[PDB]
Design an enzyme around this catalytic site. Structure first.
Site, PDB file in Angstrom:
ATOM      1  N   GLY A  19       0.801  -1.218   0.000  1.00  0.00           N
ATOM      2  CA  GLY A  19       0.000   0.000   0.000  1.00  0.00           C
ATOM      3  C   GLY A  19       0.833   1.267   0.000  1.00  0.00           C
ATOM      4  O   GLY A  19       1.995   1.265   0.423  1.00  0.00           O
ATOM      5  N   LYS A  40       1.654   0.492   8.917  1.00  0.00           N
ATOM      6  CA  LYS A  40       1.522   1.743   8.172  1.00  0.00           C
ATOM      7  C   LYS A  40       2.534   2.705   8.743  1.00  0.00           C
ATOM      8  O   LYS A  40       2.471   3.047   9.918  1.00  0.00           O
ATOM      9  CB  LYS A  40       0.124   2.345   8.297  1.00  0.00           C
ATOM     10  CG  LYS A  40      -0.079   3.623   7.481  1.00  0.00           C
ATOM     11  CD  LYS A  40      -1.334   4.391   7.882  1.00  0.00           C
ATOM     12  CE  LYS A  40      -2.589   3.650   7.455  1.00  0.00           C
ATOM     13  NZ  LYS A  40      -3.871   4.335   7.784  1.00  0.00           N
ATOM     14  N   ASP A 134     -16.404   9.512   3.271  1.00  0.00           N
ATOM     15  CA  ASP A 134     -15.708   9.100   2.055  1.00  0.00           C
ATOM     16  C   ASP A 134     -15.574   7.573   1.982  1.00  0.00           C
ATOM     17  O   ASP A 134     -14.487   7.025   1.761  1.00  0.00           O
ATOM     18  CB  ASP A 134     -14.345   9.768   1.924  1.00  0.00           C
ATOM     19  CG  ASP A 134     -13.751   9.579   0.534  1.00  0.00           C
ATOM     20  OD1 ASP A 134     -14.375  10.034  -0.456  1.00  0.00           O
ATOM     21  OD2 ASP A 134     -12.677   8.949   0.431  1.00  0.00           O
TER      22      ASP A 134
HETATM   23  C1  LIG Z   1      -7.892   3.436   2.684  1.00  0.00           C
HETATM   24  C2  LIG Z   1      -7.248   3.493   4.052  1.00  0.00           C
HETATM   25  C3  LIG Z   1      -6.080   4.446   4.162  1.00  0.00           C
HETATM   26  C4  LIG Z   1      -6.321   5.796   4.422  1.00  0.00           C
HETATM   27  C5  LIG Z   1      -5.290   6.704   4.523  1.00  0.00           C
HETATM   28  C6  LIG Z   1      -3.989   6.279   4.365  1.00  0.00           C
HETATM   29  C7  LIG Z   1      -3.684   4.942   4.103  1.00  0.00           C
HETATM   30  C8  LIG Z   1      -2.243   4.521   3.934  1.00  0.00           C
HETATM   31  C9  LIG Z   1      -1.741   4.572   2.514  1.00  0.00           C
HETATM   32  C10 LIG Z   1      -4.748   4.040   4.001  1.00  0.00           C
HETATM   33  N1  LIG Z   1      -4.457   2.659   3.746  1.00  0.00           N
HETATM   34  C11 LIG Z   1      -4.236   1.698   4.682  1.00  0.00           C
HETATM   35  O1  LIG Z   1      -4.185   1.924   5.892  1.00  0.00           O
HETATM   36  C12 LIG Z   1      -4.116   0.309   4.180  1.00  0.00           C
HETATM   37  N2  LIG Z   1      -4.144   0.022   2.866  1.00  0.00           N
HETATM   38  N3  LIG Z   1      -4.017  -1.335   2.756  1.00  0.00           N
HETATM   39  C13 LIG Z   1      -4.019  -1.983   1.455  1.00  0.00           C
HETATM   40  C14 LIG Z   1      -3.907  -1.885   3.992  1.00  0.00           C
HETATM   41  C15 LIG Z   1      -3.986  -0.859   4.909  1.00  0.00           C
HETATM   42  C16 LIG Z   1      -3.873  -1.112   6.385  1.00  0.00           C
HETATM   43  C17 LIG Z   1      -4.120  -2.561   6.770  1.00  0.00           C
HETATM   44  C18 LIG Z   1      -3.873  -3.624   5.725  1.00  0.00           C
HETATM   45  C19 LIG Z   1      -3.766  -5.035   6.055  1.00  0.00           C
HETATM   46  N4  LIG Z   1      -3.580  -5.960   5.124  1.00  0.00           N
HETATM   47  C20 LIG Z   1      -3.501  -5.534   3.844  1.00  0.00           C
HETATM   48  N5  LIG Z   1      -3.327  -6.456   2.850  1.00  0.00           N
HETATM   49  C21 LIG Z   1      -3.333  -6.262   1.444  1.00  0.00           C
HETATM   50  C22 LIG Z   1      -4.299  -5.471   0.819  1.00  0.00           C
HETATM   51  C23 LIG Z   1      -4.258  -5.278  -0.544  1.00  0.00           C
HETATM   52  C24 LIG Z   1      -3.262  -5.871  -1.318  1.00  0.00           C
HETATM   53  N6  LIG Z   1      -3.219  -5.668  -2.713  1.00  0.00           N
HETATM   54  C25 LIG Z   1      -2.002  -5.191  -3.372  1.00  0.00           C
HETATM   55  C26 LIG Z   1      -2.308  -4.067  -4.337  1.00  0.00           C
HETATM   56  N7  LIG Z   1      -3.332  -4.469  -5.302  1.00  0.00           N
HETATM   57  C27 LIG Z   1      -3.582  -3.398  -6.268  1.00  0.00           C
HETATM   58  C28 LIG Z   1      -4.561  -4.809  -4.585  1.00  0.00           C
HETATM   59  C29 LIG Z   1      -4.349  -5.940  -3.603  1.00  0.00           C
HETATM   60  C30 LIG Z   1      -2.291  -6.657  -0.692  1.00  0.00           C
HETATM   61  C31 LIG Z   1      -2.320  -6.862   0.683  1.00  0.00           C
HETATM   62  O2  LIG Z   1      -1.399  -7.614   1.354  1.00  0.00           O
HETATM   63  C32 LIG Z   1      -1.049  -8.890   0.826  1.00  0.00           C
HETATM   64  N8  LIG Z   1      -3.594  -4.237   3.445  1.00  0.00           N
HETATM   65  C33 LIG Z   1      -3.777  -3.280   4.379  1.00  0.00           C
END
Ligand SMILES: CCc1cccc(CC)c1NC(=O)c1nn(C)c2c1CCc1cnc(Nc3ccc(N4CCN(C)CC4)cc3OC)nc1-2
EC number: 2.7.12.1
Length: 266
Positions: A19, A40, A134
């Site tokens: 991410g 994160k 959102d």
């Molecule tokens: C939308 C929420 C947000 C708001 C503000 C700021 C941020 C930080 C960039 C965020 N994002 C996150 O806080 C976050 N984003 N991701 C994907 C995760 C988090 C926190 C917790 C978490 C736990 N486990 C995962 N696993 C995961 C998810 C997606 C994927 N993918 C890879 C990219 N592809 C295009 C899609 C599939 C892979 C994963 O892990 C194997 N993935 C996650």
């Protein structure tokens, strides 16, 4: 290949990045006990006081609220300094935006079960005054077939600049017509996600022109397709979620007592 970091003394071994957004990176990591997590990292080098208080506030709420529902993501630990923030969180298989981007067919059971997760998680934040305002599938993470809410839209979304993406498909009409923020704003956005899982797209997705799409979301004369389906409770839920008037639009507590959520179809 081999990389590492500490969070509050405990050492985590970085497997990969999973991410990114603004100046924050999510990593898939392993602790000293070979247990998998998602850290994160967030950078504060050029974040202003408002920005920092938005992160502090979000953190405090996420930490607090995880006790109140298990449909909110675990924040196992964090490390916060003047320069950065690590957050050692629950690791999930895939986010819902990516999951739904794979599949055409979603299993009616799985859709209902996801819908419920979403209602519960969102209802929890509402109960502590937080309107997300959102909600997209990107915001939901699948952890062992259970949807967790990743964030509360409390923090201020700063842009990268050197290098899902502000999409208005889930945007409620009241938001488009520009202080006040109703919890029923979220009901629209949830309704739009369910509409995706029901019919394969969001209601205004087929509208290619941006300004047109915005107009269509507000125009009461512009109807929404609700093609008839076996799940007539599902069709009902969607029509009730996507009422343009917020005051006529259904509430979360009501959606929870709805036949779609309560009546056992077997
Ligand atoms: C939308 C929420 C947000 C708001 C503000 C700021 C941020 C930080 C960039 C965020 N994002 C996150 O806080 C976050 N984003 N991701 C994907 C995760 C988090 C926190 C917790 C978490 C736990 N486990 C995962 N696993 C995961 C998810 C997606 C994927 N993918 C890879 C990219 N592809 C295009 C899609 C599939 C892979 C994963 O892990 C194997 N993935 C996650």
């Amino acid at each position: 290949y081999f990389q590492s970091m500490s969070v509050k003394g405990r050492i985590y071994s970085i497997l990969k990045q999973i991410g990114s957004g603004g100046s924050s990176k999510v990593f898939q990591v392993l602790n000293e006990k070979k247990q998998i997590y998602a850290i994160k990292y967030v950078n504060l080098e050029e974040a202003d006081n408002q920005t920092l208080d938005s992160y502090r506030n979000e953190i405090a709420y996420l930490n607090k609220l995880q006790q109140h529902s298990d449909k909110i993501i675990r924040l196992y630990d964090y490390e916060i300094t003047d320069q950065y923030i690590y957050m050692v969180m629950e690791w999930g298989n895939i986010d819902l935006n990516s999951w739904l981007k794979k599949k055409k067919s979603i299993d009616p059971w799985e859709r209902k079960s996801y819908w419920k997760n979403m209602l519960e998680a969102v209802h929890t934040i509402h109960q502590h005054g937080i309107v997300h305002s959102d909600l997209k599938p990107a915001n939901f993470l699948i952890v062992d077939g259970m949807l967790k809410l990743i964030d509360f839209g409390i923090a201020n979304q700063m842009q990268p600049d050197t290098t899902q993406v502000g999409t208005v498909n889930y945007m409620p009409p009241e938001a488009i017509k520009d202080s006040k923020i109703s919890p029923k704003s979220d009901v629209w956005s949830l309704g739009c996600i369910l509409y995706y899982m029901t019919y394969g797209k969001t209601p205004f997705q087929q509208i290619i022109n941006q300004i047109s799409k915005l107009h269509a979301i507000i125009d009461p004369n512009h109807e929404i397709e609700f093609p008839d389906i076996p799940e007539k409770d599902l069709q009902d839920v969607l029509k009730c979620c996507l009422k343009r008037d917020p005051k006529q639009r259904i509430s979360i507590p009501e959606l929870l007592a709805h036949p779609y959520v309560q009546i056992q179809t077997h």
